Design a protein around this ligand. Structure first.
Ligand code: HEM
Ligand code: HEM
Ligand SMILES: N=C(Nc1cccc(OC[C@@H](O)c2cccc(NC(=N)c3cccs3)c2)c1)c1cccs1
Ligand SMILES: N=C(Nc1cccc(OC[C@@H](O)c2cccc(NC(=N)c3cccs3)c2)c1)c1cccs1
Ligand SMILES: [Cl-]
Ligand SMILES: [Cl-]
Lengths: 362, 362
């Protein structure tokens, strides 16, 4: 039953994975041994090669991701050997260091032991390994509102933030058998941040905006051939609009457009002046400029869409069906300036893939 | 069979239409008489009141339309009495005049006789009553590429354009019984156009851009209670982005962003400079400024989204289900700056509604 669905997903994955690796012949025996290990044990164990390719396929199949051209060069770190919270912490620290790579970001995933009985071995509470805390009480809003619930959970466990607008949340995760998670403060030497300045407008620094270099999503489940890696943080580099058109711009996030309008010297009084649009463009130019100036990888939405067009072309040429989520693939500024806006995408779910899972806080 | 589907749609419409008009009691008899007229004749005839309300409901149910707040004030002109091509022409001329209203645009629909046996009485070839011709031959591109096929069809019928970038296409329609359509040149006195200037950048006029005041979509079918009004042109006013972010901006339309970049004095060499985004913002500011300066109705995308939020609220308060097409409701610039981007919409089709129909050219 469980064994059944596990077997089925395993067959589909192993077949596909071995064709892609040019190892079509080895399938039958590999499949045989898997059916055996399943019947005996209730599960099976991926080889390094299978796991690495599975993680790459999962990225390739992520409908909402514009950055998929580079799927085959994902750096996969196999940490299925960790057993202790010190080891998990150190693995997370290491992921940050190697992914950051002095600013020349390496798309990386660290893979922890998978769910056994549906029982998690390691459960990471962070949404991203590096993210800012958020506070809300007494009309007072500080930091990132998206982080309010996790921040509150951390402070329930004895952590205390400085209540700056950019407090780094601690790493926070729970081990199987432990009733509570543990938290560890981030060593600042590991975390690159970028001050936001503008190429022409000197006053832009008065806003004292910054953002972190490397987004490392740590709360999604990687599913490969029926195996559920609920703990498998991965990172790429940012597309500039994620920071400039959302994280810093949304009313429910840092909500900076009025302040941007003021420093760039335009009125924020009339919808018809398109001051929000103008503020968005200057804020987004500033973000790209700032990351490039500091030597931290980033991509603008036009270049990213051009890369994605090549991904589409490669899928076709390889005989692979393309799947995508138009509503997430279009960038949140000038979307009609990209080819993406002007076609449609099949939003079907293909596995291996990355999936949402319920937050253990909230 | 035909009578069946006709009866079914009629029941659903008459019931709904009479509740909304507070005439719930009159339904049963009205329904009875309709069933009779159907059985005898194979069809039925809408009262003025039914037709007017049906056209308003159809607009209310148009998923892709951000402008629906004003559905109940649509100006409905009943022209089911026309029989001759002179009458059709004059009705179209009149629609242009009354809708334009010296620049204070009145949302208007002119309704011609419906399909009888599925046989069209009047067939309008124009996509909009006012639109620019487009030419393409010998590497030479002139005017609006979207109009190339209709332009070619007009010139097959003896029309000849001046081959300016803004030739007004003639009205072109066919009568039942006629093998070919007829065409009539638009009287220039009927057509308001707006030169595009910028509020701060004087050189912007060097681009010699203009657009027409009133978009009057004339090739969609209005369906009400099983009756198919294939000829029923309607208009609102423009949302500025339709002109500034699409008609003038798309590479497959007027493709003006590079020229915009040049006149506003920025380089168009690096994706990371976001010059396309900046050019879009200035072009869109110019469009809104120009229409307002001339006293021609227009709405910006922020105000339009705010109006649409009220439409959502009204639907709720009236107990009506809301339907929408997120992919068409978001504006093509700064969509994440609108509430629309941050929620989802049920894309179900509810009738009465406006529908696509096959082009008789192409
Ligand atoms: C190499 C640079 C990369 C860029 C520039 C990039 C860009 C993006 C962007 C802009 C989004 C949309 C996020 C949003 O708007 O909220 C996204 C979504 C996503 N990306 Fe990528 N990405 C990259 C690499 C990766 C990698 C390495 C993985 C995993 C191996 C990945 C998996 C995903 C997934 C799963 C989503 C969807 C998340 C969700 O549904 O909530 N991407 N990507
Ligand atoms: C009053 C001002 C109005 C504004 C500002 C407005 C705005 C818009 C916009 C921006 C679109 C999307 C067009 C595109 O991006 O291609 C649209 C679609 C539409 N509007 Fe409206 N609209 C208005 C009035 C009307 C009226 C009076 C009707 C009919 C009675 C109507 C019916 C529709 C329909 C059917 C579509 C979809 C067309 C398609 O699917 O191709 N609208 N509207
Ligand atoms: N962008 C949208 N939603 C949204 C809202 C709030 C936060 C958010 O963060 C995504 C954040 O979790 C996330 C997830 C995956 C990738 C990224 N960004 C990156 N560059 C990478 C992180 C890791 C590898 S690449 C960031 C996304 C919408 C599109 C259309 C309608 S709403
Ligand atoms: N906008 C899109 N498509 C598109 C592409 C080319 C032309 C076009 O014109 C619509 C044009 O026929 C039209 C239709 C209906 C309304 C308007 N605009 C108006 N303000 C009105 C005309 C009549 C009443 S309101 C204009 C629409 C897309 C959104 C998402 C992916 S593609
Ligand atoms: Cl983010
Ligand atoms: Cl248009």
């Amino acid at each position: 039953e469980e064994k059944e669905i596990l077997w089925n997903e395993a067959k589909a994955f192993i077949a596909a994975c071995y064709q892609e690796l040019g190892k079509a012949a080895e399938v039958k025996d590999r499949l045989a041994d898997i059916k055996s290990e399943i019947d005996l044990t209730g599960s099976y164990v991926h080889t390094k090669e299978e796991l690495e390719h599975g993680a790459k396929m999962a990225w390739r199949n992520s409908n909402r991701c514009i950055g998929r051209l580079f799927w085959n060069s994902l750096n996969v770190i196999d940490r299925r050997d960790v057993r202790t919270k010190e080891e998990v912490r150190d693995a997370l620290f290491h992921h940050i260091e190697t992914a950051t790579n002095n600013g020349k970001i390496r798309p990386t995933i660290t893979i922890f032991p998978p769910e056994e009985k549906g029982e998690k071995q390691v459960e990471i509470w962070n949404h991203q390994l590096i993210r800012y805390a958020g506070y809300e009480s007494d009309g007072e809003r500080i930091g990132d509102p998206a982080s309010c619930s996790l921040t509150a959970a951390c402070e329930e466990l004895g952590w205390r933030g400085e209540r700056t607008d950019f407090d780094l949340l601690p790493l926070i995760f729970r081990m199987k058998g432990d009733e509570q998670p543990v938290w560890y403060e981030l060593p600042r030497s590991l975390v690159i941040e970028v001050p936001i300045t503008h190429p022409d407008i000197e006053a832009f620094s008065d806003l004292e905006l910054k953002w972190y270099g490397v987004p490392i999503v740590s709360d999604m489940k990687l599913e490969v051939g029926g195996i559920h890696y609920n703990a498998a943080p991965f990172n790429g580099w940012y597309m500039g609009t994620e920071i400039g058109a959302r994280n810093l711009a949304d009313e429910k996030r840092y909500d900076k457009l009025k302040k941007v309008a003021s420093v760039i010297g335009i009125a924020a009084d009339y919808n018809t002046d398109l001051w929000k649009d103008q503020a968005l463009v200057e804020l987004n130019k500033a973000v790209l400029h700032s990351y490039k100036k500091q030597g931290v990888s980033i991509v603008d939405h036009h270049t990213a869409a051009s890369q994605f067009k090549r991904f589409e072309e490669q899928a076709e040429e390889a005989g692979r069906k393309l799947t995508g989520d138009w509503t997430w693939l279009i960038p949140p500024i000038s979307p009609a300036a990209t080819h993406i806006f002007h076609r449609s995408y099949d939003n079907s779910i293909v596995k291996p893939n990355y999936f949402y899972q319920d937050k253990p806080y909230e």
